[PDB]
Design a binder for this molecule. Structure first.
Ligand SMILES: *C(=O)Cc1ccccc1
Ligand SMILES: *C(=O)Cc1ccccc1
Lengths: 122, 360, 110, 361
């Protein structure tokens, strides 16, 4: 199932804001920043917390929970900026909200890039 | 000739606006750009480090910033602060230490506000647990942490009381906090449910009157909170939309996306067609002008892809902002009139504000 | 015309013109600090046909102004003629060395 | 399902890597090094370098050295100038070395931040604005002391034929050679005869560096050389880059890190543009000229792609050029360079690119 496995897919597809699992990304895709969809670029630190999105997979027709962990403690990657907002909500639904820095509780809160970790079926 | 410093801003305070540039591409060098709205002239700036927030003191004398430093930027000890700057010299005066949990996020007005009397700064925290922090301006001290506001978000000052504000909570109601003269919570109250969080979520940006506030929803409805009394009374929805509007799926979109002209009750809202899940931050195709008394639209004009706005009551002006450019409108009559556009006022701004002229 | 890189006095500016930054050709924008040191240019006055010494004092202690960036090099020389050289931050000796903008101060006839 | 992890090394091997020093002049307090794979243009990572960072890679290829300035509150508070040691493969911070608060703040010429041939000392330019050369003992993690003898001189040209010797260009138009002892202090020094007229034929500081000599080009297209094969430095020049036709169209050099030497062939590379006059010495390249430094003739000329800076890899016979934002990769294994690719958007404001060292012993 290539649709569930970004490392097997075309890099150009995964590095697009239109890639299905990036449906609530407000930030730079870590896969364009020397990392991958599920690994921080070298010398940047995963956030223990995240906003969560529910994204539809058009390939297998199912909906998945996505956790948008950031990588932190390096300055802005600047590449592949996305601002997608499917099912995103304001700060009174805080863990569905993406206008805050999810590096906010890291040892260093400087925002580097954001990614889309597949948690499971919605 | 001799180069000199020590100079004040060259235009009167009443001409000044503040464009908060996040510089998201280089977010550690955010800053406030100061412009003259009458002619587009750049007047100066205030550096605000990582993801700064800004407001001007209600009395017009000082600029307040909120930011985060670290000893070595990307490593070392964190210092979250409020800074007080002189408004005319654009110089740093004092640092006020905050706990290391001030909100880091995009520049919605309600994240960094002050009491009507100007004596307390009222700011949003997220650790990611939420609370509201209170800074005593006179003392230069963080003096209160309102944990009662856990699970709520943003600060809406009550313009009819000296030290009262509301916040929007996860139950779909509003929590009101009344501060004592020491900046500690003196009393509080909770409204009945105003909106359904799951079925009709509201944008946090208030259209704020002296004694009431209106909010618009993801689906184009309007909710109101009346705080003429100690207990806030809530109501709504009424729809922004008529049947023709609905056929083309018009909905609101943007960030600081509404405003109120208090003398007329006109509410201004950024709107776009073809609304669906995920379009709530789309640039404005149009600005709609709503009569909040009759609950009907009175005018509509091109949106110029604006995302955020602000209103000056006493000069009857609206500014709008598309991320980089600021548009100046005369709103003395129901149809806004475009006066000028200030191009390249910022690289990545979602917030513009007038210098206050109304005093305290 | 003072906000253009082609203005005669700006003949060796590598930076942002302070006149575009809330200051003037000879005054720092509010809250930025003059440098006591500078590179010097010799620039040709198109009106009287004479060459003048221009002192490029910086304004310092605020982050980059970002407006009216110029990179003109008339009679500019490398760091082994240090005070003719404009690829260094002339804010380097200020209390805060962050570079904000460059002024163009007329000293007198060359 | 999945779990986000850190701690990873750079994905491409060292021999594929280049370092683009992005000054980010528009936001100079957030300068950084961008790490790229030159074989395919892939972005591999980055190192943050605060206000006006400088960068070099350790000769042994294991560490990245940066130089930068901090203040306690950026635009106010106490100043800290530092060298930082970073791991090259993990792109993580390891060590801060304190400098006196006068490290050069300026555009990224190679010669402002260098190391001795033996890799044991970092050698850097100071300016307070009084100039001196700073010496950092890599093993000790310490600043040694100012080389005050270099007052009135500028930039560091290491001598590749000696373990801890370097030269600098002085206001008298000559070169000062400094020979360090094992502790990083000056053991001896010498001053050459005048190489060039400061008034009449000023040279660009960027050396075209061989193992035992260096060449420099002038504002007016002349070439000067310094031979340090012997006990002391012997200088000569000028000879002209230009023929009559060249001269008739006023071709001159222009750029920043504007020259390179292919050591095995003796070919010198230089950015040139027509219609030279006072004030054009930093103009983008109209062409790159390839000069045989033995025959003293031009052997190739190709389009310049508006390049301002270059670097040469002796080990793979490559030249990189850089126009401020984009990096061009050239094969220079024959006299005429061949363009292999362009990496678009490698930086916003870079005047310096460098290869990860391979070999070089
Ligand atoms: C996501 O964490 C990116 C971000 C950082 C800072 C503010 C808003 C969004
Ligand atoms: C002039 O001082 C502008 C400048 C600043 C930093 C580096 C190079 C030039």
């Amino acid at each position: 199932h290539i649709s569930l496995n970004p490392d097997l897919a075309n890099e150009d597809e995964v590095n697009s804001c239109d890639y299905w699992r990036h449906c609530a990304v407000d930030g730079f895709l870590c896969s364009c920043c020397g990392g991958t969809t599920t690994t921080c670029p070298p010398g940047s630190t995963p956030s223990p917390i995240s906003w969560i999105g529910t994204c539809h997979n058009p390939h297998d027709g199912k909906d998945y929970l996505i956790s948008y962990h950031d990588c932190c403690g390096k300055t802005a990657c600047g590449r592949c900026q996305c601002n997608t907002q499917t099912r995103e909500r304001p700060g009174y639904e805080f863990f569905l909200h993406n206008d805050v820095n999810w590096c906010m509780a890291n040892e260093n809160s400087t925002f580097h890039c954001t990614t889309s970790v597949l948690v499971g079926l919605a | 000739e001799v180069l000199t410093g020590g100079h004040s801003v060259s235009a009167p305070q009443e001409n000044r606006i503040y464009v908060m540039d996040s510089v998201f591409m280089h977010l550690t060098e955010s800053r406030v750009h100061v412009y003259d709205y009458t002619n587009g002239k750049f007047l100066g700036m205030v550096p605000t480090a990582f993801n700064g927030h800004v407001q001007v003191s209600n009395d017009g004398k000082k600029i307040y910033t909120m930011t985060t430093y670290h000893e070595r930027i990307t490593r070392g000890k964190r210092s979250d602060v409020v800074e007080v700057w002189d408004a005319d010299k654009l110089t740093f005066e004092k640092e006020i230490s905050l706990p290391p949990k001030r909100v880091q996020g995009l520049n919605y007005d309600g994240l960094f506000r002050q009491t009507t009397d100007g004596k307390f700064i009222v700011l949003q925290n997220a650790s990611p647990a939420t609370s509201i922090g209170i800074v005593d301006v006179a003392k230069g001290d963080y003096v209160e942490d309102v944990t009662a506001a856990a699970g709520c978000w943003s600060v809406i000052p009550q313009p009819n009381r000296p030290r009262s504000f509301m916040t929007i909570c996860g139950d779909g109601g509003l929590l009101t906090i009344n501060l004592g003269e020491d900046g500690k919570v003196a009393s509080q109250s909770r409204s009945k449910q105003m909106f359904s969080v799951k079925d009709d979520p509201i944008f946090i940006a208030p259209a704020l009157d002296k004694d009431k506030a209106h909010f618009v929803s993801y689906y184009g409805n309007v909710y109101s909170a009346d705080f003429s009394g100690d207990e806030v009374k809530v109501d709504g929805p009424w729809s922004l939309l008529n049947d023709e509007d609905k056929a083309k799926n018009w909905v609101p979109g943007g960030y600081n996306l509404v405003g109120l002209h208090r003398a007329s009750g006109r509410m201004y809202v950024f709107m776009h067609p073809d609304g669906k899940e995920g379009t709530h931050k789309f640039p404005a195709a149009e600005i709609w002008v709503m009569d909040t008394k009759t609950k009907q639209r009175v005018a509509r004009i091109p949106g110029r892809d604006a995302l955020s706005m602000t209103i000056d009551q006493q000069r009857n002006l609206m500014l709008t902002l598309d991320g980089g450019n600021v548009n100046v409108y005369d709103i003395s009559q129901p149809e806004p009139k475009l006066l000028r556009t200030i191009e390249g006022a910022a690289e990545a701004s979602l917030q513009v504000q007038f210098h206050p002229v109304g005093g305290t």
